[PDB]
């Protein structure tokens, strides 16, 4: 009887940050209430000023990470304002029935809907828009995110001992297929509707023009680099709603990795690089042991360094010479 | 001494259906006899009427699922009628030696051959034609299928408890590389031999023009949708002889998944999406919990919805509101 | 205190062969000294005589396999002679800190450097050059290899029992992106520097022109085929520094496979085909049971047979009819 369960309202935060939550559940099952507003907006995705008409949940690419526990109910109020122009919906890979909720959440501009589902399986899961006949277009325009369903007793290593993270980041990787004129220059349109046929043709090449973390080339760099300290335990959730990726932390490892994102399975140990299939979210746990700059990339290095799939960590603390040292510095 | 083992003759059925078999072996080892006839035929692969010269085992793309038990002998009589024009053979990834049987099964039109091999490893395995110097062409023209070698005591979960399926389907996913003229229109030829150089050039782009389930765009829809009931346990075998795929059941999960198809390994639990590498068969077990329509896709959603890699389940029975419900229906 | 540990100097050998080593460590921790000389050289990569300016560690593509044990120190003296023209460095995915050693190993032509790191995690790991702003170019020009860090007590099966290999081979798979003129012919340049902008454009297509084992089409064939005997236990280490691969032994299996290369994890059993993600090294153990020729391929069969990703084993010994036999040979 759901009416006797506690409700809690959660305010979502922008990726790569994640809303406050408990790892180990401090209450019984709850109904967890989220609200998201669909926003169609112009987005600049690279250093050259290339613009697309992005389709977003809550104004970001990716949409925000939702975090609940196993056997909670998720209640999502989804709003499509009349300033938008397209029909949207939502599919949760975490849910059971009705095309992930897709069949029940079709909202024209000016409408809203409230969906509830029970989070029966623990893991990280992709969510994405999926309107009938325009699925790939919506998803490759940025309309995806992820939900994390924690086990009620938190994460465990391969021996069943507890694993507790000190920080958590969410990296959404996005393939974009920006349409090109005859010579190879990117086209510009005034509305999402204008791009449609050109977008279908660009997608059919199966060759993205950009692959980015958090919505733009270099979004997770400089002032916006991810941070941590030597000694900290960091969980990095990574999603790709459409295409395979292979994350790698340059200078580090995935100590414990659930490459396909599902926590009832034991994690893979000591990974250098792991494969997250398109349509999946994955999670990697690392303990930092050296200070300095780290690059976190898609290890198709062309996709990383030419097409944009690269971010940075800045890590503070003490250097350990036992682990690594320059014996003789570069010299004639 | 094989001459003292029972023989049994099996008549194969068209995919996605699977010939009758016992999960748990009710006899000792047997020699299991199959016959297949190679058929070269014209096939219409999409709604636009695009035609290819397909190369088939037993008249279908994919070829039929063979099912035996561990330590059975498979005896396959393979017939190439004189109405065909090419040399064919067969390679079983389930077999040991002679290039999977490839070296011993070369049959010109007008010839036949009988091969026997012991099924020493349990799992689902790809079989495909592989004639010297034309391997990719034959395989990407549709000349592949799969064999399932069950453990003698049937399937087990990750704890070793029995898993029994109520139904089994076989989904063969096929990449096609139909050659294009200067403007992007599909070419047509009178014979398989005519297409050869154009086919090599199309393949070298590494970009398929179609990716289909069971031989055509929309083959597993409408009247030909897969069916089940709430409560039923369904095994879905999925093969791709040449290219990576990432299956996903929209509205469901892979409860138990052997993504690389080999049953001595424990299954992965609660998968949203899994990666079946090119040249592999995989198997996913799901128990339906909600009625309605489900889409079963390759979750590169472009490959699914634009290039054809999408099928449907129609599931009958009772709706469960605890799992999912619309609290407030789409409204102003 | 490193100064009291034994040192040992290892002379590296050309792939696919591997320097002599002990599986089970017969000493305590050591500092293991390697030297590599960077060589920029012209390389012919196919039967048509197509030439590239390759960037090599020690004159080969891939660079040589280094083999140490867990908790050894690796000390690498890396030399860039003044006959070269580019700045190079090295990143070890096996190491912790400073971008895998990348940050500490930048050597202009005429310089050398000596790096030391502790091999804290057991597995096979990729190493590759990664100079700031030219990472993909260096890696896809051939500047990668692998390091194997054995557990001190050698390899174990999924039950913890010892697995001992009789031979070990190293297969490096390389994607090349040779630039094409208007009509599709390969371009030629006098220096590496000349190709740069054309190389960036070729890479951005994400479509390689060649995919090879050991640096050329057909390098692991004929006189240079890998060999073994019926009964031998063979470890095949396989690396791809930039792009996904799916190895398959035609006529065989991966008895025990660590597809993502990390030995603290149990191996996957009875694999037909496995996925090694770009930026990873993997390892497969097989026991030969039949004599004859085997093809070892990337099982995207286009990549194998049209673009070059195929090698051979020649295996000697006794044929076993129980496993496989031709009952009726190809006949009218
Ligand atoms: O500006 N909206 O796509
Ligand atoms: O658009 N909200 O009713
Ligand atoms: O699904 N493309 O990696
Ligand atoms: O092919 N996906 O990186
Ligand atoms: O989804 N398996 O970690
Ligand atoms: O019609 N036979 O390709
Ligand atoms: O073609 N059968 O002999
Ligand atoms: O093998 N191509 O995914
Ligand atoms: O790249 N295969 O979907
Ligand atoms: O093939 N492993 O399920
Ligand atoms: O010949 N050196 O690229
Ligand atoms: O180039 N060695 O000093
Ligand atoms: O990373 N490309 O398979
Ligand atoms: O997509 N890599 O074979
Ligand atoms: O890296 N796992 O074998
Ligand atoms: Cu949408
Ligand atoms: Cu989906
Ligand atoms: Cu054939
Ligand atoms: Cu094969
Ligand atoms: Cu270099
Ligand atoms: Cu790397």
Short mmCIF file of N, CA and C in Angstrom, two decimals, chain B residues 73 75 91 93-101 104 106-107 110-118 120-122 124-126 128 135-136 139 177 200 203-206 241-244 260 262 264-265 275 277-281, chain C residues 186 206-211 243-244 246 248 250-255 267-275 286 289-291 293-295 299-303 305-307 319 321-332:
data_model
loop_
_atom_site.label_atom_id
_atom_site.label_comp_id
_atom_site.label_asym_id
_atom_site.label_seq_id
_atom_site.Cartn_x
_atom_site.Cartn_y
_atom_site.Cartn_z
N UNK B 73 27.46 -36.34 -31.14
CA UNK B 73 28.09 -36.18 -32.43
C UNK B 73 27.04 -35.55 -33.32
N UNK B 75 26.12 -34.99 -37.18
CA UNK B 75 26.42 -35.44 -38.52
C UNK B 75 25.55 -34.64 -39.45
N UNK B 91 31.67 -23.84 -41.77
CA UNK B 91 32.56 -23.75 -40.62
C UNK B 91 31.66 -23.71 -39.37
N UNK B 93 31.89 -23.03 -35.47
CA UNK B 93 32.67 -22.54 -34.35
C UNK B 93 32.60 -23.50 -33.15
N UNK B 94 31.59 -24.38 -33.12
CA UNK B 94 31.47 -25.43 -32.11
C UNK B 94 32.44 -26.59 -32.28
N UNK B 95 33.08 -26.73 -33.43
CA UNK B 95 33.90 -27.89 -33.73
C UNK B 95 35.39 -27.63 -33.60
N UNK B 96 36.13 -28.72 -33.53
CA UNK B 96 37.57 -28.65 -33.36
C UNK B 96 38.23 -29.29 -34.57
N UNK B 97 39.09 -28.53 -35.24
CA UNK B 97 39.89 -29.02 -36.36
C UNK B 97 39.41 -28.55 -37.72
N UNK B 98 40.32 -28.56 -38.71
CA UNK B 98 39.97 -28.40 -40.13
C UNK B 98 39.13 -27.17 -40.38
N UNK B 99 39.56 -26.06 -39.78
CA UNK B 99 38.92 -24.75 -39.95
C UNK B 99 37.40 -24.77 -39.65
N UNK B 100 37.05 -25.50 -38.59
CA UNK B 100 35.67 -25.67 -38.18
C UNK B 100 34.88 -26.63 -39.05
N UNK B 101 35.58 -27.45 -39.83
CA UNK B 101 34.94 -28.29 -40.85
C UNK B 101 35.00 -27.69 -42.24
N UNK B 104 36.95 -29.55 -45.04
CA UNK B 104 36.38 -30.84 -45.46
C UNK B 104 35.02 -30.77 -46.15
N UNK B 106 33.94 -28.50 -48.83
CA UNK B 106 33.86 -27.68 -50.06
C UNK B 106 33.05 -28.42 -51.12
N UNK B 107 31.89 -27.86 -51.46
CA UNK B 107 30.99 -28.50 -52.39
C UNK B 107 30.65 -27.57 -53.52
N UNK B 110 26.02 -29.26 -57.55
CA UNK B 110 25.90 -30.65 -57.96
C UNK B 110 26.50 -31.67 -57.00
N UNK B 111 27.19 -31.18 -55.95
CA UNK B 111 27.83 -32.06 -54.94
C UNK B 111 27.18 -31.94 -53.56
N UNK B 112 27.49 -32.94 -52.74
CA UNK B 112 27.10 -33.01 -51.35
C UNK B 112 28.28 -33.61 -50.57
N UNK B 113 28.18 -33.54 -49.25
CA UNK B 113 29.22 -34.02 -48.35
C UNK B 113 28.55 -34.25 -46.99
N UNK B 114 29.15 -35.12 -46.19
CA UNK B 114 28.65 -35.46 -44.89
C UNK B 114 29.85 -35.31 -43.96
N UNK B 115 29.68 -34.46 -42.94
CA UNK B 115 30.70 -34.15 -41.95
C UNK B 115 30.19 -34.62 -40.60
N UNK B 116 31.08 -35.15 -39.77
CA UNK B 116 30.74 -35.43 -38.41
C UNK B 116 31.73 -34.82 -37.43
N UNK B 117 31.21 -34.20 -36.37
CA UNK B 117 32.07 -33.67 -35.31
C UNK B 117 31.47 -33.89 -33.94
N UNK B 118 32.32 -34.01 -32.93
CA UNK B 118 31.86 -34.15 -31.56
C UNK B 118 31.70 -32.75 -30.91
N UNK B 120 32.08 -30.91 -28.15
CA UNK B 120 32.77 -31.04 -26.87
C UNK B 120 32.56 -29.90 -25.89
N UNK B 121 32.07 -28.75 -26.34
CA UNK B 121 31.97 -27.56 -25.48
C UNK B 121 30.52 -27.05 -25.48
N UNK B 122 29.96 -26.82 -24.28
CA UNK B 122 28.59 -26.36 -24.27
C UNK B 122 28.47 -24.86 -24.50
N UNK B 124 26.06 -21.67 -27.15
CA UNK B 124 25.60 -21.34 -28.50
C UNK B 124 26.82 -20.87 -29.30
N UNK B 125 26.87 -21.25 -30.57
CA UNK B 125 28.02 -21.07 -31.44
C UNK B 125 27.51 -20.67 -32.80
N UNK B 126 28.27 -19.83 -33.48
CA UNK B 126 27.96 -19.47 -34.85
C UNK B 126 28.42 -20.55 -35.82
N UNK B 128 28.97 -20.70 -40.18
CA UNK B 128 28.90 -19.87 -41.37
C UNK B 128 29.70 -20.49 -42.49
N UNK B 135 35.33 -15.28 -48.13
CA UNK B 135 34.68 -15.49 -46.83
C UNK B 135 33.70 -14.38 -46.47
N UNK B 136 34.13 -13.11 -46.36
CA UNK B 136 33.19 -12.05 -45.98
C UNK B 136 31.99 -11.92 -46.90
N UNK B 139 29.42 -14.69 -46.02
CA UNK B 139 28.81 -14.43 -44.70
C UNK B 139 27.86 -13.22 -44.71
N UNK B 177 25.64 -5.12 -47.12
CA UNK B 177 26.42 -4.03 -47.70
C UNK B 177 26.04 -3.92 -49.14
N UNK B 200 32.78 -6.27 -52.84
CA UNK B 200 34.02 -6.05 -52.12
C UNK B 200 34.17 -4.58 -51.77
N UNK B 203 31.66 -3.53 -48.91
CA UNK B 203 32.16 -4.07 -47.64
C UNK B 203 33.30 -3.26 -47.05
N UNK B 204 34.27 -2.84 -47.88
CA UNK B 204 35.48 -2.13 -47.41
C UNK B 204 35.20 -0.79 -46.71
N UNK B 205 34.03 -0.22 -46.96
CA UNK B 205 33.56 1.00 -46.25
C UNK B 205 33.28 0.73 -44.77
N UNK B 206 33.08 -0.55 -44.44
CA UNK B 206 32.75 -1.00 -43.08
C UNK B 206 31.44 -0.40 -42.58
N UNK B 241 27.40 -12.96 -37.17
CA UNK B 241 28.59 -13.67 -37.66
C UNK B 241 29.72 -12.74 -38.08
N UNK B 242 29.47 -11.46 -38.13
CA UNK B 242 30.47 -10.51 -38.66
C UNK B 242 30.68 -9.19 -37.94
N UNK B 243 29.74 -8.76 -37.11
CA UNK B 243 29.77 -7.39 -36.58
C UNK B 243 29.13 -7.36 -35.19
N UNK B 244 29.63 -6.45 -34.35
CA UNK B 244 29.18 -6.34 -32.95
C UNK B 244 27.77 -5.89 -32.90
N UNK B 260 28.51 -13.82 -24.41
CA UNK B 260 29.38 -14.52 -25.36
C UNK B 260 29.06 -15.99 -25.48
N UNK B 262 28.50 -18.95 -23.73
CA UNK B 262 29.15 -20.21 -23.29
C UNK B 262 28.79 -20.59 -21.86
N UNK B 264 29.34 -23.03 -19.56
CA UNK B 264 30.23 -23.29 -18.40
C UNK B 264 30.52 -22.03 -17.54
N UNK B 265 30.28 -20.86 -18.09
CA UNK B 265 30.45 -19.62 -17.35
C UNK B 265 29.18 -19.22 -16.64
N UNK B 275 26.71 -6.84 -24.96
CA UNK B 275 27.48 -6.83 -26.18
C UNK B 275 27.78 -8.25 -26.64
N UNK B 277 29.85 -9.87 -29.47
CA UNK B 277 30.84 -9.51 -30.48
C UNK B 277 30.56 -10.21 -31.82
N UNK B 278 30.87 -9.56 -32.93
CA UNK B 278 30.87 -10.21 -34.23
C UNK B 278 31.62 -11.54 -34.16
N UNK B 279 31.02 -12.55 -34.78
CA UNK B 279 31.52 -13.90 -34.76
C UNK B 279 31.09 -14.68 -33.54
N UNK B 280 30.05 -14.24 -32.85
CA UNK B 280 29.60 -14.91 -31.61
C UNK B 280 28.10 -15.10 -31.60
N UNK B 281 27.64 -16.09 -30.84
CA UNK B 281 26.22 -16.17 -30.49
C UNK B 281 26.08 -16.00 -28.98
N UNK C 186 46.25 5.75 -52.43
CA UNK C 186 47.02 6.07 -51.22
C UNK C 186 48.08 7.10 -51.57
N UNK C 206 37.12 7.67 -39.10
CA UNK C 206 36.98 6.50 -38.21
C UNK C 206 36.96 5.19 -38.97
N UNK C 207 37.44 5.21 -40.21
CA UNK C 207 37.46 4.03 -41.07
C UNK C 207 38.92 3.74 -41.48
N UNK C 208 39.49 2.68 -40.92
CA UNK C 208 40.86 2.38 -41.27
C UNK C 208 40.93 1.84 -42.68
N UNK C 209 42.09 2.06 -43.31
CA UNK C 209 42.34 1.52 -44.62
C UNK C 209 42.96 0.11 -44.58
N UNK C 210 43.69 -0.20 -43.49
CA UNK C 210 44.33 -1.48 -43.25
C UNK C 210 44.15 -1.80 -41.75
N UNK C 211 43.99 -3.07 -41.45
CA UNK C 211 44.10 -3.55 -40.08
C UNK C 211 44.97 -4.77 -40.13
N UNK C 243 41.37 0.60 -31.09
CA UNK C 243 40.11 0.18 -31.71
C UNK C 243 39.76 -1.24 -31.27
N UNK C 244 38.46 -1.51 -31.19
CA UNK C 244 37.95 -2.80 -30.72
C UNK C 244 38.31 -3.88 -31.68
N UNK C 246 37.99 -8.46 -32.10
CA UNK C 246 37.29 -9.65 -31.68
C UNK C 246 38.01 -10.91 -32.17
N UNK C 248 39.47 -14.60 -32.92
CA UNK C 248 38.90 -15.92 -33.11
C UNK C 248 39.96 -16.84 -33.74
N UNK C 250 40.25 -19.96 -35.84
CA UNK C 250 39.44 -20.77 -36.77
C UNK C 250 39.86 -22.22 -36.67
N UNK C 251 38.94 -23.05 -36.18
CA UNK C 251 39.20 -24.48 -35.94
C UNK C 251 39.47 -24.77 -34.47
N UNK C 252 39.56 -23.71 -33.67
CA UNK C 252 39.81 -23.84 -32.25
C UNK C 252 38.87 -22.97 -31.41
N UNK C 253 39.32 -22.74 -30.16
CA UNK C 253 38.61 -21.96 -29.15
C UNK C 253 39.62 -21.24 -28.25
N UNK C 254 39.10 -20.35 -27.41
CA UNK C 254 39.83 -19.83 -26.29
C UNK C 254 39.37 -20.67 -25.13
N UNK C 255 40.21 -21.60 -24.70
CA UNK C 255 39.85 -22.43 -23.54
C UNK C 255 39.68 -21.57 -22.29
N UNK C 267 39.09 -16.37 -15.57
CA UNK C 267 38.95 -16.36 -17.01
C UNK C 267 37.59 -16.84 -17.46
N UNK C 268 37.21 -16.39 -18.66
CA UNK C 268 36.04 -16.91 -19.36
C UNK C 268 36.44 -18.20 -20.05
N UNK C 269 35.57 -19.21 -19.95
CA UNK C 269 35.76 -20.56 -20.53
C UNK C 269 35.14 -20.70 -21.91
N UNK C 270 35.83 -21.44 -22.77
CA UNK C 270 35.28 -22.02 -23.99
C UNK C 270 34.81 -21.02 -24.95
N UNK C 271 35.48 -19.88 -25.01
CA UNK C 271 35.10 -18.82 -25.91
C UNK C 271 35.30 -19.19 -27.37
N UNK C 272 34.35 -18.80 -28.21
CA UNK C 272 34.53 -18.90 -29.69
C UNK C 272 35.20 -17.65 -30.19
N UNK C 273 34.74 -16.51 -29.70
CA UNK C 273 35.21 -15.22 -30.10
C UNK C 273 35.09 -14.31 -28.85
N UNK C 274 36.02 -13.39 -28.67
CA UNK C 274 35.98 -12.50 -27.51
C UNK C 274 36.29 -11.07 -27.94
N UNK C 275 35.83 -10.10 -27.16
CA UNK C 275 36.01 -8.70 -27.47
C UNK C 275 37.11 -8.09 -26.61
N UNK C 286 44.97 -21.68 -25.17
CA UNK C 286 44.41 -22.82 -25.86
C UNK C 286 45.35 -24.01 -25.84
N UNK C 289 44.42 -29.68 -30.13
CA UNK C 289 43.90 -31.02 -30.15
C UNK C 289 43.86 -31.62 -31.54
N UNK C 290 44.02 -30.79 -32.58
CA UNK C 290 44.12 -31.28 -33.95
C UNK C 290 45.27 -30.63 -34.67
N UNK C 291 45.93 -31.38 -35.56
CA UNK C 291 46.97 -30.84 -36.41
C UNK C 291 46.34 -30.06 -37.56
N UNK C 293 46.39 -26.50 -40.47
CA UNK C 293 46.42 -25.04 -40.50
C UNK C 293 45.25 -24.43 -39.73
N UNK C 294 45.55 -23.40 -38.94
CA UNK C 294 44.51 -22.60 -38.30
C UNK C 294 44.67 -21.15 -38.71
N UNK C 295 43.58 -20.45 -38.91
CA UNK C 295 43.64 -19.01 -39.08
C UNK C 295 43.24 -18.38 -37.77
N UNK C 299 37.28 -11.27 -36.02
CA UNK C 299 36.09 -11.89 -36.63
C UNK C 299 35.03 -10.86 -37.09
N UNK C 300 35.41 -9.61 -37.31
CA UNK C 300 34.79 -8.87 -38.39
C UNK C 300 35.57 -9.30 -39.61
N UNK C 301 34.93 -10.18 -40.39
CA UNK C 301 35.58 -10.91 -41.47
C UNK C 301 35.98 -10.05 -42.62
N UNK C 302 35.40 -8.85 -42.71
CA UNK C 302 35.85 -7.86 -43.66
C UNK C 302 37.19 -7.36 -43.15
N UNK C 303 37.26 -7.03 -41.86
CA UNK C 303 38.52 -6.50 -41.31
C UNK C 303 39.62 -7.56 -41.48
N UNK C 305 39.72 -10.38 -43.75
CA UNK C 305 40.06 -10.90 -45.05
C UNK C 305 40.22 -9.86 -46.13
N UNK C 306 39.66 -8.69 -45.94
CA UNK C 306 39.84 -7.60 -46.88
C UNK C 306 40.81 -6.58 -46.40
N UNK C 307 40.86 -6.31 -45.10
CA UNK C 307 41.72 -5.26 -44.62
C UNK C 307 42.99 -5.78 -43.98
N UNK C 319 46.09 -36.68 -36.25
CA UNK C 319 44.68 -36.33 -36.47
C UNK C 319 43.75 -37.18 -35.60
N UNK C 321 40.03 -38.57 -35.23
CA UNK C 321 38.76 -38.79 -35.93
C UNK C 321 37.54 -38.72 -35.04
N UNK C 322 37.70 -39.00 -33.77
CA UNK C 322 36.62 -38.87 -32.83
C UNK C 322 36.10 -37.42 -32.80
N UNK C 323 37.02 -36.46 -32.78
CA UNK C 323 36.65 -35.03 -32.77
C UNK C 323 35.97 -34.56 -34.03
N UNK C 324 36.42 -35.05 -35.17
CA UNK C 324 35.96 -34.58 -36.47
C UNK C 324 36.40 -35.55 -37.53
N UNK C 325 35.48 -35.87 -38.43
CA UNK C 325 35.82 -36.67 -39.58
C UNK C 325 34.87 -36.37 -40.73
N UNK C 326 35.37 -36.51 -41.96
CA UNK C 326 34.54 -36.50 -43.15
C UNK C 326 33.97 -37.92 -43.33
N UNK C 327 32.66 -38.09 -43.23
CA UNK C 327 31.99 -39.39 -43.39
C UNK C 327 31.87 -39.73 -44.88
N UNK C 328 31.39 -38.78 -45.67
CA UNK C 328 31.31 -38.88 -47.12
C UNK C 328 31.96 -37.62 -47.71
N UNK C 329 33.08 -37.81 -48.42
CA UNK C 329 33.83 -36.68 -49.01
C UNK C 329 33.03 -35.99 -50.13
N UNK C 330 33.26 -34.68 -50.38
CA UNK C 330 32.54 -33.98 -51.44
C UNK C 330 32.51 -34.72 -52.78
N UNK C 331 31.31 -35.00 -53.27
CA UNK C 331 31.09 -35.87 -54.43
C UNK C 331 29.75 -35.56 -55.10
N UNK C 332 29.63 -35.87 -56.40
CA UNK C 332 28.36 -35.75 -57.16
C UNK C 332 27.20 -36.51 -56.51
#
